[PDB]
Design a protein around this ligand. Structure first.
Ligand SMILES: [Mg+2]
Ligand SMILES: [Mg+2]
Ligand SMILES: [Mg+2]
Ligand SMILES: [Mg+2]
Ligand SMILES: [Mg+2]
Ligand SMILES: [Mg+2]
Ligand SMILES: [Mg+2]
Ligand SMILES: [Mg+2]
Ligand SMILES: [Mg+2]
Ligand SMILES: [Mg+2]
Ligand SMILES: [Mg+2]
Ligand SMILES: [Mg+2]
Ligand SMILES: [Mg+2]
Ligand SMILES: [Mg+2]
Ligand SMILES: [Mg+2]
Ligand SMILES: [Mg+2]
Ligand SMILES: [Mg+2]
Ligand SMILES: [Mg+2]
Ligand SMILES: [Mg+2]
Ligand SMILES: [Mg+2]
Ligand SMILES: [Mg+2]
Ligand SMILES: [Mg+2]
Ligand SMILES: [Mg+2]
Ligand SMILES: [Mg+2]
Ligand SMILES: [Mg+2]
Ligand SMILES: [Mg+2]
Ligand SMILES: [Mg+2]
Ligand SMILES: [Mg+2]
Ligand SMILES: [Mg+2]
Ligand SMILES: [Mg+2]
Ligand SMILES: [Mg+2]
Ligand SMILES: [Mg+2]
Ligand SMILES: [Mg+2]
Ligand SMILES: [Mg+2]
Ligand SMILES: [Mg+2]
Ligand SMILES: [Mg+2]
Ligand SMILES: [Mg+2]
Lengths: 90, 58, 59, 42, 95
RNA sequence: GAGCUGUACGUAAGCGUUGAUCCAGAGAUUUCCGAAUGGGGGAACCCACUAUCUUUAGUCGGAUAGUAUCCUUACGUGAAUACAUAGCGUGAGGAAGGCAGACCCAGGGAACUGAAACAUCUAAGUACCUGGAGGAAGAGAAAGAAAAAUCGAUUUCCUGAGUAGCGGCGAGCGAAACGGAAAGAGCCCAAACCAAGAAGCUUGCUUCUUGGGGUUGUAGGACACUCUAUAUGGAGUUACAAAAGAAAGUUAUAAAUGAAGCGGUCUGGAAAGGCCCGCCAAAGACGGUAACAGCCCGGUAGUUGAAAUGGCUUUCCCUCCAGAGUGGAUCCUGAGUACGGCGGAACACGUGAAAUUCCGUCGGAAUCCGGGAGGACCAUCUCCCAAGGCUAAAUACUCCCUAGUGACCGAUAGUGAACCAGUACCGUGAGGGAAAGGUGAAAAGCACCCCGGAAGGGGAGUGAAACAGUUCCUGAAACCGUGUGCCU
RNA sequence: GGUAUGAGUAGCGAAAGAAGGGUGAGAAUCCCUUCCACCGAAUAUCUAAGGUUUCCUGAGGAAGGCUCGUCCGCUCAGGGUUAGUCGGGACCUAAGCCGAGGCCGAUAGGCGUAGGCGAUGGACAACAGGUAGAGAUUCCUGUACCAGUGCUAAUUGUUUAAC
RNA sequence: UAGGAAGAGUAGUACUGCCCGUACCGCAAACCGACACAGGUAGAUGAGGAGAGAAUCCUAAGGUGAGCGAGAGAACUCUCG
C-alpha cells in the first residue's frame, strides 16, 4: 500500500518554512526506499515528484522518573514536486 | 576410526607400573584400511584384522 | 460485522481501501492538529481489521 | 596508554553474537547467560 | 456488587448510619459507591482547575459497598438481596 | 449484567442493556533476528536469482511463491573406460536447534582431601566435559538362586550386616542369597522344514528375497501319522501385529444458586469490641468492611451448570488369529561365537588360590552320544540351555499446573530479587552483582492570608491524629544543638 | 548501616587580568564594550577512530560544576543530520577467517579442496558560488560529468552471418 | 579467438539513478585514563621577520585568559635571579 509507506506529515519551523519552495516533509516507513516514497506520494496526492531526499533519525534517549528509554527511530523524506505540479495542502 | 563390520574402536583403561601406579591409556583396535563392498560399490574402509579373519570381500 | 458478511469479497476489498484512505486522512489531520474527534482513528483501524478477518474467513 | 583501546569492529568480532554462536563453547556461554536471565547476551 | 447506580441504599455503618441516599456512582474495582448527601468532604480546590473562582468545595466521597443495604419499595426497609429468574434475564429479589 | 477506555499522580476524545469492559473454549493475524535454511553478515542487517502478476513511454519501482546442507530412497542423466560404476540433476521422505543448573543411560574422567608424611589405596567413577535420550530410564522372563528339598523374570523397600570378605590386612572399602513386603506379565525371532518366485547356471543341484512354519531341557521343534477348530470362540494398538473411527458416561478449562441481626444500648473518628436480647448452621473456611463479624460484603456447606476444546473410562466399530495328542529314522536349536594366553577394567573382592562379567589383541571349541554353572581345578550329583530381540507395574526426579499444609521467614530475615533485579553498577570478556517495603478509613493530599525570587516557614482549613503533610506507622542509640540547678 | 574524631584543618588540578555598561531577588565568576595578556609546526583549520545527541532554540537553577552562578557539556521541553558523483555497500582481492564433498580423530572436534568472506591496499562520474538558530561537494542557483532508459529522425544489417 | 546473433550503433530530445553514514566533540571538559584528571590519542593543512630550519624569539589568520577569590609580603619549603 502507499498509505503504509507515508506515515504522517512533519510540521516544524523548518518543514513549514520550505512549503512555499514546494518541498513537503513526511515521516515515512523506516523500510521505505526514496523510490517507494516517490511513487507513494504520487498515488496519494496526485502530484509529480522531481526529487525525494531521505534521512534516518536514530531514537532519542528520554528519562521519566528513573525509567530511561529511546523514542522511535524515524525516517524523514523531503519530497520536491515540479513547478507545473499542483501543491500539497497541510 | 572404527571397524565398519564390527564396531571395534579405541577404549580407555590403565597402564600400571610395578608399584602399581596407574595412568590412563587406550587400546586401539587393529584396524586396517581395505577395499570391500558392504554397499554394492567397493570402498576403502577401516576393518579390524579380527573381522578380516575368516570370510570377507577384499 | 454481520453487515460485512452480506457484502461480496470485491465489495469488502473496496471498503478497506475507503477506510485506509480515511485512516490516512485522520492521521494527517492529527499531525497538523486539526482532528478533534481523535477516537475515530481507533474505530477505523478496528474496522479495517474486521474487513481483513472476514475476507480471510472466506478462504 | 591504558588497556581498553575501543574498536566497534573488534568488540563484535571477538565478543559478538555471531562469534559466540560459531563455537560450541560460545553457545554454552549464550545458554549460560540466558539461564541467568541476562538482558544482554553478547 | 449487590447495589448499582440508581439504587436507593440505607447506610448501616460510619458517621452517616441511618441516612439513606441514591447511588450516584459505583467503583466496583475499589468496591466503593457514591451515595447522594453521604460522606461529605471539604476539598481545598486551587482556582486553576474547572471552577475559575476555586475555593473549599463540599462534595460527596465514596463509601465502602458493604456499608450500604438496598431498599425494597414495598416494605421501605433495608434487605439482603437474592436473585430469581423470570425467564429472559434474572432480577434482584428482597427477603 | 453495568459500567468501561491496564499501571500510576493526568488531560482529551469516545464506547456501553440493540448488551460494552471483563472471564473461558476455539479460530484468524503473527514484522525482523535466532537451528535460520536463497547468498553474505559485526544477531535483529545487507544483497540476490527463477517463475507469475502488477506499475511506467521505458529504465527505475511493487506483490506473491520457490531457491540451504546432509541422510535415506525412487527416477533420470553419466567420466577416465567397452559394459558399467563414480560423479551430476530432479522428486519424495527424514534430520538439524533448544532445554528442568533435576532424574536416567553411555563415552571420556580430575584434584584438593584422608592415610596425622606419601607412592599402593582414599577422595571417586565423584566434579566436570561429550553423546544419547524418556516421561521415566535402566533391568527383565534363568546356560539364574540354591543344596532346610526346593524356588521359579526384573525392579524397589525392610532385613541379613557394618556380618562374609577386601585392604601398604594400613586409612578405609564392604556384599549377596535366604526371610519379610510393594508390584506383578509375559512374549517375538534365528534354525530345521514347506510353498512361491528370483537368479547362479555348481546346468535340476546350490544361495538370495518374500510368505508360511517354529521357539525349547530327564528337552522342544521340524518331520511322520491322529483329533478338533478355519472366526464357533479368542485377542488387540502398554510388549505379545497395526491403523482407523463413532457413540455414551465422566473429569478439566468460565460460572450459577446459596441460611441467619440495618436487634437494643455503652465507649468511640468509626463497632466487627463491652453489656443485654435474638437467630442460622450439611454454612463457626478464608478474606474484606473506619477497632476483633456465622447472621454487612465477596463468599463458605450443600445443590446446580458447559456452546467449544482437551483428557480419561466403557461399549460398539474396525483389525488380527489355529491348538491338543502320539512317536525319536533322520534333521534343527544363535562361530571367529564360547573359551584360552597376554594386557586392562567391572565385580564389596587391590591378581590373589580368584570363580563370575566386560574391553583390546592373538589363538580358538563342542555343536545333542551336545553345552554351561554350583568362587582355582577334577570327578560325581544338582540346577540350567549362552553367543538374537521386545516387555507394563512397583522406583527416581520437578522447570511447571491445581488445591492445600507448616510449634518455616517477616524487610540486615525470607530467594540475589516483597520495590520494573539478574536491573543499576563493575569488568575487554567469561563473569561478578547490590541498595531500595509502611500518609490516612477515606485524598478529605493543606482554599485563603502572611514573609520569601524560590525553597522553607507561620497562620487558616481537612482529619481521630499533620509532632500522620506525597516517601509521610513506630521512631532506640551514637552524634549535633538551645536552655539552665550545682561545680570549675 | 548510621555518626563522630582529625577540622573549619589539607585541598580547591600548571596560566593575566582590568574597568565601564547591562541583566537579575541576588553578580569577581552570566552578557556586551574597550584596553591588557597568552598560543601561533599551535592552544589554529580539517579529518579518522572513539563517544552517541553532548549539537540548536526556549525555559530552569534542586542536584552536578572542587567557589559563585542569572551561566553550563547539567535539568525540562521542543527541534536539528537531505548525496547517481563524498566514505562504505549493490566492484576487487591481501593477511587472516570460514569451508560442500574430502582427510584425520574416544565423544566433542581438528585440518583442508572447490568455493566464499575479509581493507589497512586496487578500481570508480561535480565543481564554483549562495544561504543559515542547528546540514551542506548533500539544500538552492549556475555550469557539468557518469551509467542507463524510452521517444523522434536519418543510417546500416538481417545467415559467407552488422553487432 | 571459442561461442551467441537481427538488430545494432550515430545524432537529437526528455526522463531514470537504490541502501548505509552525514548532527556535535575530535591534542579534547564530549575519545582511553573512576574526575570538567598537567598523562595517552593515527593522518591532512600548518603564514611573516631574522633563520639552514617545522629550531629560536616576537607576531598573522585564527584561537585563548584555563570554574575559587581578596589581602599579606614572617619562619620554612619549593621554583628562580
Ligand atoms: Mg543519504
Ligand atoms: Mg571501560
Ligand atoms: Mg455479550
Ligand atoms: Mg538467510
Ligand atoms: Mg595429615
Ligand atoms: Mg449471605
Ligand atoms: Mg458515641
Ligand atoms: Mg486502628
Ligand atoms: Mg482490621
Ligand atoms: Mg583379564
Ligand atoms: Mg576393585
Ligand atoms: Mg568354572
Ligand atoms: Mg581375550
Ligand atoms: Mg566359565
Ligand atoms: Mg564348588
Ligand atoms: Mg567366596
Ligand atoms: Mg540352547
Ligand atoms: Mg533481602
Ligand atoms: Mg523495620
Ligand atoms: Mg521524610
Ligand atoms: Mg592541625
Ligand atoms: Mg595550616
Ligand atoms: Mg591553604
Ligand atoms: Mg583551576
Ligand atoms: Mg616550535
Ligand atoms: Mg550547547
Ligand atoms: Mg555550587
Ligand atoms: Mg541557562
Ligand atoms: Mg588468502
Ligand atoms: Mg581461495
Ligand atoms: Mg566484500
Ligand atoms: Mg555546524
Ligand atoms: Mg540540488
Ligand atoms: Mg559536520
Ligand atoms: Mg586532559
Ligand atoms: Mg604519538
Ligand atoms: Mg588576531
Amino acid at each position: 500500500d502507499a498509505r503504509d509507506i507515508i506515515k504522517r506529515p512533519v510540521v516544524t519551523e523548518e518543514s513549514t518554512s520550505i512549503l512555499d519552495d514546494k518541498k513537503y516533509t513526511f515521516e515515512v516507513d523506516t523500510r521505505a526506499t526514496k523510490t517507494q516514497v516517490k511513487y507513494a506520494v504520487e498515488e496519494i496526492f496526485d502530484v509529480k515528484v522531481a526529487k525525494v531526499n531521505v534521512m534516518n533519525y536514530k531514537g532519542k534517549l528520554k528519562r521519566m522518573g528513573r525509567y530511561a528509554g529511546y523514542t522511535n527511530k524515524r525516517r524523514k523524506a523531503i519530497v520536491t514536486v515540479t513547478a507545473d505540479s499542483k501543491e500539497i495542502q497541510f | 576410526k572404527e571397524c565398519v563390520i564390527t564396531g571395534r574402536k579405541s577404549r580407555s583403561g590403565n597402564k600400571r607400573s610395578h608399584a602399581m601406579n596407574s595412568s590412563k591409556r587406550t587400546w586401539k583396535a587393529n584396524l586396517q584400511k581395505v577395499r570391500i563392498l558392504v554397499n554394492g560399490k567397493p570402498k576403502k574402509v577401516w576393518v579390524s584384522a579380527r573381522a578380516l579373519k575368516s570370510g570377507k570381500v577384499e | 460485522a454481520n453487515d460485512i458478511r452480506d457484502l461480496s469479497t470485491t465489495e469488502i476489498q473496496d471498503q478497506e481501501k475507503a477506510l485506509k484512505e480515511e485512516l490516512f486522512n485522520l492521521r494527517f489531520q492529527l499531525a497538523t492538529g486539526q482532528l478533534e474527534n481523535t477516537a475515530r482513528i481507533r474505530e477505523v483501524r478496528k474496522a479495517i481489521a474486521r474487513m481483513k478477518t472476514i475476507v480471510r474467513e472466506r478462504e | 596508554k591504558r588497556t581498553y583501546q575501543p574498536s566497534k569492529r573488534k568488540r563484535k568480532k571477538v565478543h559478538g553474537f555471531r562469534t559466540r554462536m560459531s563455537t560450541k563453547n560460545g553457545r554454552r556461554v549464550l545458554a549460560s547467560r540466558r539461564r541467568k536471565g541476562r538482558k544482554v547476551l553478547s | 456488587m449487590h447495589v448499582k447506580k440508581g439504587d436507593k441504599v440505607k447506610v448501616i455503618t460510619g458517621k452517616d448510619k441511618g441516612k439513606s441516599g441514591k447511588v450516584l456512582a459505583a467503583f466496583p474495582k475499589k468496591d466503593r459507591v457514591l451515595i447522594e448527601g453521604i460522606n461529605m468532604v471539604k476539598k481545598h480546590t486551587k482556582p486553576s482547575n474547572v471552577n475559575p473562582q476555586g475555593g473549599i468545595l463540599n462534595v460527596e466521597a465514596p463509601i465502602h459497598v458493604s456499608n450500604v443495604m438496598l431498599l425494597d419499595p414495598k416494605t421501605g426497609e433495608p434487605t439482603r438481596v437474592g436473585y430469581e429468574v423470570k425467564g429472559d434475564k434474572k432480577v434482584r429479589v428482597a427477603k
